[PDB]
Amino acid sequence: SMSYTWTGALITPCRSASLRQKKVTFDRLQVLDDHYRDVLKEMKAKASTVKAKLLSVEEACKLTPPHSARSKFGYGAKDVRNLSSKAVNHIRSVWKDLLEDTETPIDTTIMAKNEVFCVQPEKGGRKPARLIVFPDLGVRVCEKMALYDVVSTLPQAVMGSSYGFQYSPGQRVEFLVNAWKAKKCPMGFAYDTRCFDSTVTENDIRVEESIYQCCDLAPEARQAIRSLTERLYIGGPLTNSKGQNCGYRRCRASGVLTTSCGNTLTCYLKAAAACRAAKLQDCTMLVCGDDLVVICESAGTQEDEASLRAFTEAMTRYSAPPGDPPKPEYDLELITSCSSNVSVAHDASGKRVYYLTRDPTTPLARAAWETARHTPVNSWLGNIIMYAPTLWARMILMTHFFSILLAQEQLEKALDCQIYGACYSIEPLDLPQIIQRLHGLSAFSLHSYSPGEINRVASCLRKLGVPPLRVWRHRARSVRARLLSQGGRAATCGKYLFNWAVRTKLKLTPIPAASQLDLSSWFVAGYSGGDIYHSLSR
Numbered sequence: 356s357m358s359y360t361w362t363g364a365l366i367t368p369c370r371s372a373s374l375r376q377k378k379v380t381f382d383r384l385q386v387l388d389d390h391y392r393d394v395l396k397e398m399k400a401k402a403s404t405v406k407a408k409l410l411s412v413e414e415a416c417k418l419t420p421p422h423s424a425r426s427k428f429g430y431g432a433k434d435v436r437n438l439s440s441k442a443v444n445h446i447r448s449v450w451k452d453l454l455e456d457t458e459t460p461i462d463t464t465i466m467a468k469n470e471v472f473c474v475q476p477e478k479g480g481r482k483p484a485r486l487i488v489f490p491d492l493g494v495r496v497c498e499k500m501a502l503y504d505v506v507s508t509l510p511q512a513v514m515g516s517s518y519g520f521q522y523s524p525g526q527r528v529e530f531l532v533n534a535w536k537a538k539k540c541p542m543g544f545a546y547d548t549r550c551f552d553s554t555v556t557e558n559d560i561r562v563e564e565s566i567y568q569c570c571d572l573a574p575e576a577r578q579a580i581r582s583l584t585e586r587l588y589i590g591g592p593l594t595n596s597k598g599q600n601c602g603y604r605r606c607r608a609s610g611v612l613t614t615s616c617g618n619t620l621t622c623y624l625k626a627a628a629a630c631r632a633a634k635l636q637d638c639t640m641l642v643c644g645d646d647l648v649v650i651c652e653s654a655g656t657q658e659d660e661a662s663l664r665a666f667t668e669a670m671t672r673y674s675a676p677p678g679d680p681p682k683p684e685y686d687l688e689l690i691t692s693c694s695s696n697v698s699v700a701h702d703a704s705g706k707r708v709y710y711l712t713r714d715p716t717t718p719l720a721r722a723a724w725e726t727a728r729h730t731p732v733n734s735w736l737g738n739i740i741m742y743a744p745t746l747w748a749r750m751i752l753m754t755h756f757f758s759i760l761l762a763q764e765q766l767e768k769a770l771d772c773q774i775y776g777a778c779y780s781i782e783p784l785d786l787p788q789i790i791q792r793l794h795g796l797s798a799f800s801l802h803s804y805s806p807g808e809i810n811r812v813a814s815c816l817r818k819l820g821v822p823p824l825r826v827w828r829h830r831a832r833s834v835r836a837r838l839l840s841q842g843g844r845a846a847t848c849g850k851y852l853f854n855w856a857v858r859t860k861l862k863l864t865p866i867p868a869a870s871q872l873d874l875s876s877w878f879v880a881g882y883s884g885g886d887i888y889h890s891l892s893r
């Protein structure tokens with residue numbers, strides 16, 4: 356079937372949408388084999404060990420982001436979080452309807468996503484806007500009731516150590532380094548699927564449900580999962596922001612609770628089956644949605660090239676063709692997975708420390724957009740948290756934003772940021788404790804950065820018109836001095852985040868209060884498009 360069908364009614368604002376529509380619109384041809392069936396049975400056997408809880412209306416309401424799109428039925432995210440009678444009554448009727456109606460397609464809104472990318476006129480032109488498909492607020496709360504515990508627990512139970520979202524950036528690095536070191540002669544590659552969401556078939560969605568159905572579930576949760584699969588997950592009609600009929604979808608919706616979980620399970624299933632078809636030796640996989648990384652035993656240069664073509668042919672049959680053809684790599688640092696690469700630095704005692712980094716162009720351009728205009732989500736804050744050990748996040752992002760927060764006297768004001776797909780409300784004064792917990796004390800003492808990493812950062816600053824690193828060192832010293840003068844958590848920000856800036860670097864002992872932070876919900880699962888929210892506690 357066609358991934359999408361269109362009426363011709365425009366994807367309306369809340370211009371490049373038409374270019375995206377052409378790429379994502381195609382008929383899918385899927386052919387399954389015994390490798391696929393074997394991997395599926397193995398995945399199902401692991402899913403069989405899961406017991407999932409039905410969330411109450413209240414618990415599901417508490418997970419709703421405060422700025423989540425309002426319902427077309429006379430209530431918004433604030434009403435949901437406050438447990439308002441109107442919101443609650445509507446949620447209970449949406450739920451009752453899921454239990455009673457097993458067939459009627461549920462309506463979804465289609466929107467062009469507004470994302471900031473860097474204006475590079477050297478290697479090509481402007482990329483089209485991504486498309487977001489999501490159901491009404493009442494349906495989104497019901498999804499949580501039936502599937503929040505499933506999407507949070509099942510991927511790890513099924514995929515084990517291959518499930519990427521259970522790891523913090525440091526644990527992701529440790530996984531990859533250990534996998535690389537475990538091989539006699541390692542070879543690794545990233546597999547990029549062309550428009551993954553559009554490659555997801557109705558059968559892929561039902562196979563995914565077959566995995567969810569292996570959980571121990573309450574009868575209502577079981578019915579709701581069955582109804583949500585047929586009425587929403589498999590496809591349904593598309594409505595633009597103006598309320599007009601845009602067409603229809605027969606592929607993955609990017610804005611449903613099961614997007615991340617479903618994409619991870621589907622990518623894993625297809626990739627593990629393709630590994631067997633290609634006869635890749637001693638495979639270690641790391642999957643994050645449609646992002647796949649494979650580390651295996653090299654069979655020789657020519658053999659490795661042949662095995663990747665074979666892997667690609669199998670992924671193509673399974674309806675996961677490549678965007679860019681995969682390339683074998685013989686250094687771990689050369690693999691870009693989740694837009695990131697492994698790099699190494701030294702701690703205060705000269706000991707080797709592996710960390711995750713990336714090209715800083717997009718993070719800096721988005722930070723520049725956020726500094727210029729008020730935004731709902733602060734990507735700069737997410738990049739500080741995720742890339743805390745990096746030269747660019749420490750010297751540029753921390754320095755720039757802490758000088759702004761000092762000037763605005765907003766150090767204690769909680770800000771919303773995304774941690775892989777979920778929304779977290781974080782006070783910037785909590786950054787030293789968060790960083791210590793996710794990356795370790797060494798994140799504040801790292802030095803001896805690689806020449807390639809230093810050069811990538813420096814060239815990027817030049818290209819974007821950002822002052823050089825020496826200017827940032829000078830700015831951090833003033834920022835640090837002012838933070839120190841304030842005491843408490845503000846002084847900790849100065850002492851810990853800006854220890855790299857000082858002439859004579861300070862000792863740095865663990866932050867006593869860091870252990871108190873409740874990071875239990877943090878690196879459990881991916882919730883991209885899942886409409887998930889949390890406020891940082893203790």
Ligand SMILES: O=C(O)/C=C/c1ccc(NC(=O)C2(NC(=O)c3ccc4c(C5CCCCC5)c5n(c4c3)CC(=O)Nc3ccccc3-5)CCCC2)cc1
Nearest residue numbers: 719720722723724726751752755819820821822823825826
């Ligand atoms: O020879 C030497 O010794 C070096 C000298 C030198 C060179 C340039 C400056 N620049 C400045 O002082 C000003 N800008 C900045 O001090 C500045 C700060 C952050 C900047 C950013 C980002 C960095 C990441 C957080 C968001 C802000 C960008 N740009 C920035 C400029 C340059 C800019 O204007 N815009 C963009 C656009 C895209 C990406 C980055 C930028 C402020 C007043 C006049 C312009 C200062 C000193």
